Structure formats: C-alpha cells, structure tokens
Design a protein around this nucleic acid. Structure first.
Ligand SMILES: O=P(O)(O)O[C@H]1[C@H](OP(=O)(O)O)[C@H](OP(=O)(O)O)[C@H](OP(=O)(O)O)[C@@H](OP(=O)(O)O)[C@H]1OP(=O)(O)O
Ligand SMILES: [Mg+2]
Ligand SMILES: [Mg+2]
Lengths: 151, 359, 507, 538
DNA sequence: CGATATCG
DNA sequence: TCAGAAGCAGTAGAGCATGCATATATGCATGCTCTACTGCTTCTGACGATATCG
C-alpha cells in the first residue's frame, strides 16, 4: 500500500505517487513506478478535465515508466503531457503557476530503485533544502555508500 | 473513531454530538454525509447504554422522529435505511423503559419489511435493508422478548425469517445478511423453543456448513449460533423423556460420525466433543464403551499428527492446543483410563510445552 | 461528447472611448448594442439550456476585479448558470444613463494588454468544476487594430491566442460598427480560429451574427439519451442489444414549487398516512388494496398488483415480418420511438442490425415484435418499420438510420363508429373543391409552428422575474389568418356554397 | 342505453366427448361464456343477461307444459350479471346425457326475450348460441323463427367447435380434418341459411369458432355502445364552413376501477386518512399551514412566485370549439413517424343534413385525387390547449371520413445525431450474412398470397386481439373472489398462446434461426438476470 | 326561442 | 366527458468506494447514489350540450 498523501512538507506545489484530492492544484506530477497503489487519481475525471484546461502541468517519470503507462488504453490521454527524464541526470523543473505568471525552479534527480521496470527515486533540491523520496525501493546492506548522486 | 478510542471520557459533549448528528441528518441530503451521521449516534448509544446520560438524549422523541420518517411515501436510499433500522432496533436495547409503548409497533414494522424483502415475487431484494432489519431485530429482542410459550405466531415467523436469512439457497459474495442472521440466532435461540426442535436436522447441517466458511466474522457467528443451538437442544432433550428416541440417537450418531471420521480438522472434533458433553451431561446417557472409543481415536490421531509425523508441520503447532483441550475434556469423562495410552499423553504434553515459543 | 458535458460562453466587451462614442445618427452605441446582445443571449439561454455557463468580462476599464489582480480588467460575472439577477445587473448598464452608471462604477477609456485579457479568460475557464463540452469567447469590440503603434503586445496577444486555440477554446469575433471601417485582416485575422471567408473587404456596420443572437429562441433543449437499453430477441438464443430513443416528445411546462410566502423559499413536503381513529402511523406493510364490485370486496396485497400486469421479461421478442402495404396509417396509438444498436452490451449487434435494416428496406417489410419496455409491464405489439438515412444540406444527417418502432393498437383500443350513409358529390363539385384547395395549398415544415401556451408562459415568467410590468404577448402562429386567405381564393367560396348548399341554410 | 342478451349453451353429451389432445367443446364454450360474463361483470356496465341451458338431465321452461321443449333449463333469467352467475358457470354446470336441439333453444330464447323485456327499455337485443350441430332437430319452425326475428329485431350469433397439433386460440385452423359428420354438415348448411336470411350475406360472417372467439372480441360486437360525437364546424376561410361531427376511433383503453387503499385489519377505506404536511428545511422543522403557500416556478436557478390567480388572469386565452384548415400540402412531405398524440379522430359529416355531407365528400375526394393533406387547427373547448394536426382522406366502400392525428410543435422536435451504418466499415456485413438474413425473412413471413389474385393476407392480425392484461386482471379478480385464501393462478394457456405467431412459422424458421446463429457472432459481456426475492429465499 | 340547472 | 395536472416509480449515465488475500499488489469487480427524464395512474374541474321551465 502507499500511506503517502503525495505532497512533501518542503515543496507542497508538487505531488508524487498520489493525485486524488489536494493534488489537483499541484504544478507538477511525479510517478515513481507503475504500481496501482502509487497511481491513485491518475485516471480521475477531475484530473482529465484539468489536463484539457492547462498547458504547463506535466507528469515526470522514468522512460520505462512512460512506456509501461502509455501502453494501457486508459492512460493514453497523458501521451502529450508526460516528460521522461533519464536517471542520474540533474534536470531543472519549472513550477510555473497557471493563473499567475509566477515561476519557481527546482532541480530533480532520478535514482534507480531496483524494484520493478521503471522504478526510480526522486531527489529534489530547491530553496527549502534537499529532500529524497524513495518510493518502494530495494537496497542491500552496504549499497547506500555506492550512490554517486547522493554523495 | 475518537468515540471508539475514548468511550466514556466524553461525558459533557455527548448531548451536543447527538444534536449535531440529528441536525446533519435532518438538514442534509447526501447519504455520504448521512451514513456517518447515524453511525456516530449508534456509537453514542452503544457507549452510554447503562450511563445516566440516557435521560437528556430524549430517546422517545428520537424514536418518534425516526418512525415518522419511516412512515413517508418519499423513499430514502438503501444504505441509510439500514442504519435507520439498526438505530430503531438499538433504541429498545439501550433504553427499554421508554420503549414499552413502541416495541409492539416496531416489531410489526420489522416483520413487514423482512417479509417484503424476502417474500417478493416482483422485485429483487435489497441486502443492506435486510442486514439492517436483522440487526434491529437482534437488538430489539434483547429486552422485548417474544417466545413460543408467549406468542407462537411472531416467534415462529421470526424464526422462519432467520432460517431464510442463514439459508444458502443462492450462493452470494457478500455475507452481511447471513452474518446478521447467525448473530440473531446466537443471541436469542432460547426464545424459539419448539421451532429449533422440529427442523433440527437442517439447522445442524447448515450450522456445520457455515462453521467451515472461509470468513472469520461469519465463522465466529456460526460457531456461537451452533453452540447456542446445541445447548438449547441438549437442554430440551435432557429435560423431557419424549425427545430421547429420535433426537438423542440422532445427535449421538452425528457426533460419533464426526469423531471417527479420518478427514476432520480440530474445529469439527472440538465441536463434536463440546456437543457430546452438553448432551450426555444432563441426559445421563454416558457409556464407557464409546467414551473410551473416542478417547483412543483422539489419542491415535494426535500421535499420528504430531508425534510420529516429524515433518514440516506449519499449521499443526497452531492447532495442537485445541487437540489437547479436546483430549482433556474427553479424559475427564471416562473413569477407566487405559494405561497403555498414558505415555503417548505425557510425551504429547511435553512436546506441546516444547512448542511454546512458536506461538 | 459526454452526456454530462455542458457549454461555456464568455462575453468579452471592450470599454474604450470608441465603444461609447460611435453614434453617427444617434441610433445605438456599440456598448449599448453589446449589452442588448448579451441580454438577448442570456434570455434565450435561461430557458433553452439553464445548465450552461455564462460570464461577462469588460476590458479596458479603469478599475479591476480579477483572481490574479491584473490591470484594467474587471470580471463582472464569472462562469455560472444564468439567472434573473445577472440580467438585472446587465440592465443596470443598458439604458443611456446606464453608460454613466457604468463609467461611475467601473470607468472607461484606459490602456490594456490583450494578452492579459485572454489570460483572465483562460483562468475563468480553468475554474469550472464541471465538464465543458464547448468553450467559446465572443469578443465585442470596434477596434480593427487594437494594439496599434506597438508590436510586442501584438505578438504576445497572438501567442496567447494560439495557446488558447491549442487548449480548445473557440475564439470568434463579434465586430461592431466602426466609423472608418473594421478590417479584420490587420490584427484579428491571426487571432480568430476560423475565418468567414467573406470579410476580405472592410465592414461599415455591425456583424451579421448579432442579428442572429438577438432572436430569442425559447425552446428547452435536451441531450441525446436512450429511453431504455433493451435486447432485441430474434430467438431464445440470438439476442442483440439495441437502444430506444425518442425523436418526438411532448413539451411540458416546468412543474410548480411550493413556497413560503414570507421568505420565498421552497418548502419540504412529506406526505404521511395514519389511522384516523387511533392516530398511529401506517406503513406500507400495514396496508392492503381492495376493489369493491357490487357486494363483494376483492382483497389483494401490494406486490400482487404487479403480478397482475407482468407477462415476460423486458426486451423485444421478434415475431414474423409483415409488408408495409398492410400497415394502416390511421392506426396510431402512441408516438413512434426509434431503435438503434448499442454495441456495448453484446458484441456483434451492429452488423446484424445493419443487415436486417438493408434486407427490410429492399423488401419493404416491417418486423413485428412484442414490446415490453420495463419490468412488470403488459406487452404491446410493435412493427419495426425500417428507416433509411437521408443525407441532405451538404451532407447533413437529417434522418438517422435504423428501425421505426410503431405501436399497434389492440382490439379494444379501436372504438366503434356509428353507422352512416355515404353521400357523394358530383364531378363539378369535386373539381371546384380541388381548385379551391390548390389555391390554398402551401409547403409544410415541422418546425414552422410553436406552442402558444408554452411561449406565453415563458413570456409571463420573464415578466415576473425581471419585474417588468409589460408582459410580451407572443403572436399566435397557429392562427389560420382568415383576413388573408379570403383575399387569395377570391370569390370561389360563395360559388361553392351556392353549388353545394341549399338556397337558404343555417350552418 | 341498455341491451338485452341471452346466452344459449348446449349441455348435451355430444360436446362431452374427450377428444385426445383437444379439450372438449363443452370446456371451450365454458371458457367463452366465462370470459363474456366476467367482462360484463367487472366493467360494471348497466346490462341484463340470461343463461338458457338446453340438453340437460332436468327440464325447466315456461312453455315446458305439454311434453314440449324437453331438456331445456333456464338457469338464469334476465338479470344483472354478478358473482352468482360466475360461480354457477365455474362449478355447478355439469354435462347432460340427453341431447336437445338448438331450434327449440332458439324458440325458448325468443320466449325469454319477449316475455321478460316487458317493463324495460332495451335498444338492442341479442342471442348467442354455443352448439355442436350434431343433434337431431326438425325443419318446420324455421320460417316462424325468421319472421319473429325480423319483426322483433333480434340479433343472432353462432359459436361452434369448428370454423366454417391444436392450441386453444393460437391463430390456426380450429376444425379437425374430416371431423365433421353429416349431421354437422346439414346443421352448418341450415345455420348458414338462417344467418343469411336475417341481414344478408354479412350474416354468414357472424359464425365463429370456440378458439376463434377467445382472441377476437367477437362476443361483444353487437352490444358495445357507440362513441360521443363532437359537433363543430370545419371552416376554410372567414365565411366558408362545413358542419362536421368527430368521433374517437382509436384510444388507449385503460382500467376504470382504481385500487382503493384500505387498512390491513379493517377492510374499510374510511379508516385511512392521507394527510399532507408542509415544513421548512430547518433543524427544528417548523410546520407550515396550507393557506400560507404560494405557487412558484423555477427560472434559471431562481424561483419566481407565480400565484394561481395571476397565472389564470395571464393565461393564454383562445376561442374554443374551433376547427380551421391552415392549408394543404402533399402527403409525401408529412410522415407518420412525427405523429404525437393519444387519440385518433375520424371527422364525419353533420348528423342529418345532406349539404354538409356532400361538401365533406367533395373535400375528401379532392384531397384523395391530389394525394394531399389538410393541416388544421384543432381545439376541444375553451380550456383545451390549441393544437395542429393532419387531416387526410380515408375512402372506404361503406363510408367517408377524415382522419385527424395531432402534429408536433417546434419544441417537440429533437435532433439526435447517430452514427451511420451504411459506411460502417467496422460492422459491414458480408454477402453470405445478407443471404442468411434473406432466408430468415422469407421464412418468417406472416403474410400469404391466396385466391390466385395474390392479395395480402396476414397470418397474425394483431389489430384484432384483445388486451391480455384485462383478461388476466379479470381472471385473477375472479379467482380471488371465489377463492379467498389462495395464491394468484398462473396465466391461462389460451391467453399465452394468442400472443404468439402460428406454429408453422416457427417450425419453418427453426433452420434459418440456427443459420443466423452460425454466421453472426454474439458475445455477451455479463448476464445478471434480476431474480426476485422469492426465487432467492424460497 | 329564453335561459337555468343539470348531468357526462 | 375528457383534457390536463400531480404524484409517483423506473432507468441511463456518470461517478465512486470497497473488498480482494497473508499480496503489498491487487486492478478488478461489484454494488451503490444522484439527477433528469419519461410514463402511468389517480384526481379534478371546467364545459358544452341538452333538458327543463316560461
Ligand atoms: O371485418 P373485415 O372484413 O375483416 O374488414 C375490416 C373492415 O373493413 P372492410 O369491411 O372494408 O373489409 C373494417 O371496416 P369498419 O367496419 O370499421 O367500417 C376496417 O376498419 P378500418 O377501416 O378502421 O381499418 C378493418 O377492421 P378494424 O376496424 O378492426 O381495423 C377491416 O379489417 P381488415 O383490413 O383486417 O380486413
Ligand atoms: Mg506500489
Ligand atoms: Mg512497489
């Protein structure tokens, strides 16, 4: 299961692995992997109605996650709104507001999780410090000291 | 959830919580914001049943309001009618003093709704309403009892409705209705005096069938109902002399067949031992030629299951205590204990003690 | 697309100096004309589809009222269901003194950025909590080149209009009367989505769509929805799923609502039955149904009256076929429904449906069936008359393909006609009648007549809602207008009378 | 407007023959008479009927004195039908050994009609006969019967076990092949003669079978009351007009007796009170009176108070009793699929004058020759809402009239867009499927060409079958009134057989049905049949 | 023919 | 007499929750509410003809 409310305390403008109730106001969506417990609200009618009324909101995930997600016919409406990101590649995400022209830049880094095809971690770096989201990962003892991007 | 956590700690806010629940139930229309409005009131009434706070709740006015709502041609959804029936049934249990003038009226309502939901040839039944009516009846019969020696018609139609509820005529997927029926049968089996003594064969069959179900709450309800039924039937067959020739031999044959059967887990063995006890106790029909038989059977089964069978007993350890309890219950009955089966027993208890950390 | 989807329309009216000062001969200012058009649209939509969303936004003003606090943009009304109070709020600016009231409340004659106006419109479109089928923004302005002497704002507005059109927002132009001339090729050619292909020249007056929007068409519109999803049973095994649709439904006025005369709010009605003697309430389980015939009294339960009127399961049991030549046109019992396959309950129903349709069309046969619409309903005999689609008006479907469900009356539905003698007429009389009929013949259209009672009720409701004491009297379009028919036939009537009537006769 | 009718049933031993596979003619006559008397009782129409049982063991007749009219028993005099006659027909009617004849039965029926309808006023008098024609009789009293029928204006109908496998009322040949004896042959000849000698050639059509009479409503043909005329004027302009009378020819037939709401214990309706209480949607739920409530409508999410008096004084006022032709147009531009109404009107001429008759006939013939219709503006009275409709000519060999069907307004038209099926490449059927459907349609034909003139003759006249719900309601009410504590009986077999096509069509379509099943694939998503509560908790 | 009150 | 108006019951179509086992993923199935719309049944009252009185 996933007891996560898809909303970090440091960055409440982004929601991860949860798009049900309060994540309809988020500025960017992230998807760790393609398990059903981490995909609540991803096919909601309210989210469908919001996607067709916005242009700056996207769904970031691993390329394998994108391939596994676009194959399902129920999630093919995300085809033009999914932006895949390579692992271990620090990219800058623009958290631009739809209504007002306000903008906010954040740096995200995808780290391998070793769980299922397309499972990755999320390492955010912004104004409120560095946070890490290891959604359903699998690491043996003595492997945390081998992640280059965490050092 | 909070009232479930701190039940009696909410002394002064109970009246205000009840008022807010009533206001939400009255002014609002959505059932999603209405089911909890009745669940919280039911929790309030179940938490403060014996407390003196039952005077400011105005049980009479609440019952009058809900009964007037029942007598409305405008239909409410099925899910809220279940909670309404459950609350109306509970109103007679927590405060029967103010329900002496309304229980006779409410029994007719429950019976009519049950007949409409279970004897309809033009419309499909409504299982939530059925479960609500069953729970309301099981909560109302707690104080305003109706026995066969008091009134046969009502006590017989209630028993027939309970039968039809627990009857697996058409196998379903939701077990709310049969669970409520089994709980009703377990609570007030002492009222259907002559009822359970006529279809006792089918009753025992269906109770054995439900006791082996995969569900847990349904299993517990079926076990309680079977225990109550066996107790009542044993009392009735041991009190008078005209019930022996059929019922005594029938139940003894059933118990012996359950015991001597080779494919019977600890549940059926324990049920058979408890029934044999409850029956042959007051009836004074104990005969050592079969008590020793079942004793040797249980000892040999325990030996072949736990002692000699030295393999991956993943579930055997988690059911050895039931075997030990049954063996003790049997051993306490017979007076001539075979001395050849004393080692197997001592070593069995030793090996059961050894398996203690695995629990 | 979706059944739950509704429409959205945002009125975008300019408030510049040219909008208030264009009275060449003092007939109507562009702002007053826009207010009149908006009120006409509100009135025509508050009865037709009272579930759509309407919003009125004025740009170029002095004050501002936005969710993002943009400058010179005042959102008067947000996207919501049209009501009577918004009509009055727009009436506040309708009159000539309404212009002064507007300029004192919101002001006018200020600079603006057309990108921020479209941004506020998109923000309003993004605040809807319902599904919107169509999003349309009608711009009421008289500026053929609004962002003159500046290219950055023009490029920004073009980019924002492109973004809106990519979002799926229909953006049409309602150009008003420009003194010098309104040419859309300058700026608005790259802003609007579709070009009417006739404005290559310049306009000197109002747009051609304003007169279309000013015609208040009051007729409640209903979305397509099947009455029932039955199952055509060609046999106990061969069964296909079809949808029953109604193409002709009687229009009824909305039912009244019980109110409290003091607070003008709806009241809650709770019917309740109780014993008159004891006073205790009575439940449906404590009630029987009786029917006294003479001295006897038949007693039946509630659920037995439904057993009385049930024969089989709901659906369409297929009987044999009958030619259309033996289907009498005067055998009308109920309005005809429409059958159409669903292809959602069973797989392979549309192919068999089309095959049956083709074979019945080329053979002009009508499949007789037994129509049972709902559970516990007596069965009726219907003939599935095949109907072929007709593509006319540059390939616009006016008739859908499928079967025509026609109800057939039973033996007791047909009444008895009294006996009479067949008195005929002479060839001279029949020729005179033929001539007088050819004189008065005309072309009939199904939508040429309106229900006068319903239209009068609509006018009365408008008069009582807008608090105008001059209720419009809808002209009865069903009257024969005898004051003009006699002028066409001439003197045939008295001749025919003298031919077929006695010298003296009291009709 | 009452009407006398005497039922004459034969109770001889002849009809008591148990034919294998077919019910006895006595049972079929019992069914027909039961249906007749139950529709006469439950309709509560003022009428008096009489039952004359002839061919019985006993003898009871006013003219029985003198060793005449033997085995004739008048089981019921001319009285209002009730449940007593129902119980009699159902239970205490037993077959008789001796076989009487239908001629003396007709004699005693005339006797009853002419000696019991003395102080009453009956505009119609009818006699029905249920015989087998296999009994002996004479040939003398025929002319006397003919003269008495022609002088007393008596209408007659004959019902036989055969027409002029086997399912009771299943749209098939009721007569068994070569099962008619010579006595029955001469009886048929004499009854055809006596029917022709009464009202002409159409009298021969008044002979129906027993199974035929159960699904044709023929027993109520000469007793039903005519419709009420609607007198008005068919105007063309401001001066030209025609005196016309309009009747309702087709109308939805519904039950007239409602179901009374009575208490469960006391079967009296006076012990029930239906109270309506209005209250605000507040927490305290303050009760509201009746005189402080004003009618209001809904106008775009708002509520506008529109009182009854204000709605009346502002209501659309129209001149009632108007029927004016709006114009004319070709019949091809107005289809029957747009008809919107609940009743069909046949516009006839004036009552007695001939000028309006000639004018309306000329109008009908002119509309027929030009194949055009007459759009009119019909209104029932001062209060009815005005409506427009079609008025097309209906020319028959016996009468002339204009048929009126209401037309829809602009607000009654709905433009629903459906996908096309001709270019449906996802569902275009193959040519073999087309041939299979062709074979199925040609096999399931309900019409046939006979008499070598190749005219249409439908094998399933659904426009002549009575409504089965009425017969079901009548039989259920009868069962409950004669069996107070018993479940409702199932649907009778003849009712369930008259609602089905002839068995020959099904037997011929057996193979095309399987052929259609083979080619067309039909996969059902999820079948969840709605089973009632009794089927789950029996 | 008035025109009033039924009666459906 | 009968048109028209309430009053009530059923359904389509969307939407949502929960129940699923020793799985942490189930996605999947199932069953319920809500709302607008249509239809049937019961009730009412105005109305026009035609009966009766002058
Ligand atoms: O009784 P049938 O011989 O079977 O024929 C009748 C008869 O028409 P014909 O006398 O010209 O054959 C009816 O005429 P009416 O007695 O009503 O004047 C006619 O009525 P419609 O013109 O209204 O259709 C219709 O009988 P029904 O009224 O039951 O429809 C029709 O029946 P068929 O066309 O089947 O022969
Ligand atoms: Mg997961
Ligand atoms: Mg995982």
């Amino acid at each position: 299961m996933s007891s996560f409310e898809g909303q970090m305390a440091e960055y409440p403008t982004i929601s991860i692995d949860r798009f049900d109730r309060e994540n309809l106001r988020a500025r960017a969506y992230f998807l760790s992997h393609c398990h059903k417990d981490h995909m609540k609200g991803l096919r909601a009618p309210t989210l469908k109605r919001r996607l067709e009324c916005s242009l700056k909101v996207y769904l970031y995930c691993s390329p394998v996650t994108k391939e596994l997600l676009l194959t399902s016919p129920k999630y093919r409406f995300w085809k033009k709104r999914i932006i895949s990101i390579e692992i271990e590649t620090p990219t800058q995400i623009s958290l631009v507001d739809e209504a007002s022209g306000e903008k906010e830049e954040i740096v995200v880094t995808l780290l391998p999780a070793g769980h299922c095809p397309g499972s990755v971690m999320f390492l955010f770096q912004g104004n409120n410090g560095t946070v890490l989201y290891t959604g359903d990962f699998r690491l043996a003892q003595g492997e945390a000291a081998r992640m280059e991007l965490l050092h | 959830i909070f009232l479930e956590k701190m039940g009696q700690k909410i002394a002064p806010y109970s009246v205000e919580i009840k008022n807010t629940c009533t206001s939400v139930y009255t002014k609002d229309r959505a059932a999603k914001c209405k089911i909890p409005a009745l669940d919280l009131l039911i929790k309030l009434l179940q938490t403060f049943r014996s407390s003196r706070l039952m005077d400011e709740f105005k049980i009479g006015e609440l019952f009058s309001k809900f009964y007037g709502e029942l007598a409305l041609k405008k239909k409410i959804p099925d899910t809220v009618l279940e909670k309404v029936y459950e609350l109306l049934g509970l109103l007679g249990e927590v405060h029967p003093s103010e329900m002496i003038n309304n229980a006779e009226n409410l029994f007719r309502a429950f019976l009519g709704e049950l007949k409409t939901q279970m004897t309809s040839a033009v419309r499909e039944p409504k299982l939530p309403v059925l479960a609500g009516c069953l729970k309301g009846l099981s909560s109302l019969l707690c104080n305003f009892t109706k026995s066969m020696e008091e009134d046969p018609q009502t006590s017989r139609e209630i028993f027939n409705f309970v039968l039809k509820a627990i009857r697996p005529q058409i196998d379903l997927k939701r077990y709310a209705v049969p669970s409520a029926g089994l709980r009703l049968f377990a609570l007030h089996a002492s009222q259907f005096s002559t009822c359970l003594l006529d279809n006792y064969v089918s009753l025992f069959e269906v109770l054995l069938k439900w006791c082996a179900h995969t569900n847990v709450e349904l299993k517990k309800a079926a076990l309680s109902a079977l225990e109550s039924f066996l107790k009542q039937v044993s009392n009735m067959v041991a009190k008078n002399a005209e019930m022996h020739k059929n019922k005594l031999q029938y139940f003894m044959e059933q118990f012996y067949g359950i015991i001597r059967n080779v494919d019977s887990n600890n549940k059926e063995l324990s049920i058979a031992i408890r029934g044999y006890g409850l029956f042959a106790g007051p009836c004074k029909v104990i005969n050592a030629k079969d008590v020793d038989f079942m004793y040797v059977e249980l000892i040999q089964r325990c030996k072949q299951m736990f002692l000699t069978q030295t393999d991956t007993g993943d579930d055997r350890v988690y059911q050895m205590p039931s075997f030990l309890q049954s063996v003790a219950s049997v051993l306490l009955y017979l007076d001539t204990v075979p001395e050849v089966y004393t080692p197997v027993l001592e070593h069995l208890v030793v090996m059961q003690i050894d398996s203690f950390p695995q629990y | 697309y979706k059944y739950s989807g509704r429409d959205s329309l945002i009125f975008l009216v300019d408030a510049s100096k040219a909008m208030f000062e264009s009275q060449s001969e003092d007939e109507l200012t562009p702002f007053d004309m826009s207010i009149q058009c908006i009120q006409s649209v509100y009135i025509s939509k508050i009865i037709s589809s009272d579930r759509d969303l309407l919003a009125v936004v004025f740009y170029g003003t002095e004050k501002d009222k936005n969710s993002v606090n943009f400058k010179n943009i005042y959102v008067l009304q947000e996207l919501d269901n049209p009501g009577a109070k918004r009509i009055l709020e727009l009436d506040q600016f309708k009159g000539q003194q309404g212009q002064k009231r507007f300029q004192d409340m919101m002001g006018h004659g200020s600079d603006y950025s057309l990108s921020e106006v479209l941004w506020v419109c998109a923000n309003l479109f993004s605040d809807v909590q319902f599904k919107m089928s169509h999003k349309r923004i009608m711009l009421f302005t008289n500026e053929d080149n609004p962002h003159g002497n500046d290219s950055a704002k023009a490029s920004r507005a073009r980019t924002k209009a492109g973004d809106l059109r990519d979002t799926g927002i229909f953006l049409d132009l309602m150009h008003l009367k420009k003194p010098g001339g309104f040419d859309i090729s300058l700026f608005y050619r790259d802003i609007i989505s579709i070009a009417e292909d006739e404005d290559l020249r310049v306009h000197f007056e109002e747009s051609s769509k304003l007169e279309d929007l000013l015609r208040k068409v009051r007729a409640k519109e209903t979305r397509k929805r099947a009455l029932s999803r039955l199952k055509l049973k060609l046999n106990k095994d061969i069964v296909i799923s079809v949808g029953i649709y109604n193409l002709v439904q009687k229009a009824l006025k909305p039912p009244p609502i019980k109110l409290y005369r003091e607070t003008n709010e709806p009241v809650k009605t709770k019917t309740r039955t109780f014993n008159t003697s004891t006073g205790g309430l009575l439940l449906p389980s404590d009630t029987k149904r009786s029917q006294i015939y003479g001295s006897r009294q038949i007693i039946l339960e509630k659920e037995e009256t439904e057993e009385l009127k049930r024969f089989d399961d709901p659906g369409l049991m297929l009987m044999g076929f009958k030619p259309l030549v033996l289907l009498k046109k005067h055998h009308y019992l109920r309005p005809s429904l429409f059958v159409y396959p669903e292809e959602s309950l069973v797989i392979g129903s549309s192919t068999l449906f089309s095959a049956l349709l083709i074979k019945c069309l080329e053979k002009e046969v009508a499949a007789l069936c037994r129509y049972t619409p709902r559970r516990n309903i007596p069965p009726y005999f219907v003939a599935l008359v095949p109907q072929e689609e007709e593509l006319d008006d540059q390939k616009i479907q006016v008739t859908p393909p499928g079967f025509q469900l026609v109800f057939l009356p039973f033996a007791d539905d047909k009444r008895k006609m009294p006996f009479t003698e067949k008195i005929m007429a002479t060839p001279e009389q029949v020729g005179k009648m033929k001539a007088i009929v050819e004189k008065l013949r005309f072309t009939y259209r199904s939508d040429s007549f309106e229900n006068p009672v319903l239209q009068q009720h609509f006018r009365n409701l408008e008069a009582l809602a807008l608090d105008l004491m001059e209720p419009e009297q809808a002209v009865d379009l069903t009257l024969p207008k005898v004051e003009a028919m006699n002028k066409r036939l001439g003197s045939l009537v008295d001749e025919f009378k003298e031919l077929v009537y006695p010298p003296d006769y009291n009709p | 407007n009452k009407a006398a009718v005497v039922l004459c049933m034969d109770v001889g031993f002849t009809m008591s023959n148990s034919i294998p596979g077919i019910e006895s003619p006595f049972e079929q006559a019992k069914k027909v008479i039961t249906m007749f008397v139950q529709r006469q009782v439950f309709a509560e129409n003022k009428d008096e009927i009489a039952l004359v049982l002839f061919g019985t063991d006993g003898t009871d007749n006013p003219l029985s004195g003198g060793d005449q009219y033997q085995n004739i028993t008048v089981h019921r005099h001319l009285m209002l039908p009730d449940f007593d006659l129902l119980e009699d027909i159902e239970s205490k009617i037993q077959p008789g050994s001796q076989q009487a004849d239908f001629l003396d039965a007709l004699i005693v029926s005339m006797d009853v009609i002419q000696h019991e309808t003395i102080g009453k006023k009956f505009e119609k008098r009818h006699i029905e006969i249920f015989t087998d024609l296999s009994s002996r009789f004479s040939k003398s009293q025929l002319d006397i019967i003919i003269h008495s029928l022609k002088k007393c204006d008596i209408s007659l109908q004959f019902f036989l076990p055969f027409s002029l496998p086997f399912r009771l009322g299943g749209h098939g040949p009721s007569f068994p092949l070569k099962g008619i004896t010579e006595q029955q042959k001469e009886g048929l000849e004499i009854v055809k003669m006596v029917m022709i000698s009464l009202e002409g050639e159409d009298g021969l059509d008044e002979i129906y079978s027993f199974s035929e009479s159960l699904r044709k409503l023929c027993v109520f043909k000469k007793i039903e009351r005519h419709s009420i005329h609607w007198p008005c004027r068919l105007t063309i302009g401001s001066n030209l007009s025609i005196r016309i009378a309009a009747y309702k020819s087709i109308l939805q037939e519904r039950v007239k007796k409602t179901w009374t709401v009575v208490d469960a214990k006391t079967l009296k309706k006076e012990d029930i009170q239906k109270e309506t209480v209005y209250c605000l949607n507040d927490d305290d739920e303050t009760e509201v009176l009746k005189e402080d409530i004003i009618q209001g409508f809904r106008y775009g999410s708002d509520i506008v108070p529109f009182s009854k008096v204000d709605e009346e004084q502002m209501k659309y006022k129209s001149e009632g009793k108007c029927f004016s032709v709006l114009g004319f147009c070709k019949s091809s531009q107005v289809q029957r699929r747009f008809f919107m109404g609940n009743q069909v009107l046949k516009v006839f001429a004036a009552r007695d004058d001939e000028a309006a008759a000639v004018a309306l006939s000329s109008l009908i013939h002119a509309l027929d020759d030009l194949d055009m219709v007459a759009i009119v503006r019909y209104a029932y009275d001062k209060r009815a809402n005005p409506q427009v409709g079609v008025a097309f000519p209906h020319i028959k060999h016996n009468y002339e009239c204009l048929v009126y069907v209401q037309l829809p307004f602009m607000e009654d038209l709905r433009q629903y867009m459906f996908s096309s099926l001709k270019n449906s490449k996802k569902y275009a059927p193959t040519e073999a499927q087309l041939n299979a459907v062709d074979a199925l349609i040609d096999s399931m034909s309900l019409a046939k060409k006979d008499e070598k003139t190749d005219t249409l003759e439908d094998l399933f006249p659904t426009t002549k079958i009575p409504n089965p719900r009425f017969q079901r309601l009548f039989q259920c009410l009868l069962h409950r009134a004669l069996h107070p504590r018993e479940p409702l009986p199932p649907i009778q077999q003849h009712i369930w057989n008259m609602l089905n096509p002839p068995a020959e069509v099904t037997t011929k379509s057996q193979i095309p049905l399987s052929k259609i099943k083979t080619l067309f694939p039909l996969i059902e998503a999820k079948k969840k049949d709605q089973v009632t509560a009794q089927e789950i908790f029996q």
